[PDB]
């Protein structure tokens, strides 16, 4: 059965039906067994595409919303549509965070550092997506949850993972983005990204032919963000 749900996720991905792909991997996760590296990637790709479509739509509508003719009826329609997409995005994030808290982070053994960092980074990511759309009083809690997940992931990867590991590099990338875009803290964002970049550069001789691409891709993104920010 499990292999058939995973095959279904692979088919849904080929058909670019990411709602189906996420539903299949959600079912696999709820079987309460650890995910293989391929299953973990399939789960991550599925929900990244599902939430990414909601995030992209929200950014378009929110940008259009800030635009006036004095037509209170047009503004009301635009803001109600934004709220509809917003609630869809929040429901996706709530589903992923429940999977992380109830199954994925939970089933990680004390020494399963790579999976722990991967899932904690994911937890920080999806609270960050909640923080992107939250306003007013409700925003502070999801910002705090995002920083807390990223911080724990950062401490584990710093102690136990090589600086060139793609999961450690990607954690620093998204954590630095959190500081810049969510916390409006460019000095902290630049320090985190530059330290991770330089720590990986110092050990570039350690990458193999197969590993080099995953790490150098993130290293280019770290440099691109630093170039943008400075």
């Amino acid at each position: 059965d499990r292999e058939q749900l995973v095959q279904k996720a692979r088919l849904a991905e080929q058909a670019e039906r990411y709602d189906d792909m996420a539903a299949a991997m959600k079912n696999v996760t709820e079987l309460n067994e650890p995910l293989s590296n391929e299953e973990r990637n399939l789960l991550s790709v599925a929900y990244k595409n599902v939430v990414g479509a909601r995030r992209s739509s929200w950014r378009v509508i929110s940008s259009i919303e800030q635009k006036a003719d004095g037509n209170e009826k047009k503004i009301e329609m635009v803001r109600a549509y934004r709220e509809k997409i917003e609630k869809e995005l929040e429901a996706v994030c709530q589903d992923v965070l429940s999977l992380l808290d109830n199954y994925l982070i939970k089933n990680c053994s004390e020494t399963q550092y790579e999976s722990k960092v991967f899932y904690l980074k994911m937890k920080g990511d999806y609270y960050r997506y909640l923080a992107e759309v939250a306003t007013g009083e409700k925003r502070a809690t999801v910002v705090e949850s995002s920083e807390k997940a990223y911080s724990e992931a950062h401490e584990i990867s710093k102690e136990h993972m090589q600086p060139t590991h793609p999961i450690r590099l990607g954690l620093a990338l998204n954590y630095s983005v959190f500081y810049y875009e969510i916390q409006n803290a460019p000095e902290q964002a630049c320090h985190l990204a530059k330290t991770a970049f330089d720590d990986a550069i110092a050990e570039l001789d350690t990458l193999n032919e197969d590993s080099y691409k995953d790490s150098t891709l993130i290293m280019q993104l770290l440099r691109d963000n630093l170039t943008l920010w400075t």
Partner: peptide, 7 residues
């Protein structure tokens, strides 16, 4: 343009 996260 805008900050880039992991793809």
């Amino acid at each position: 343009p805008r900050s880039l996260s992991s793809p």
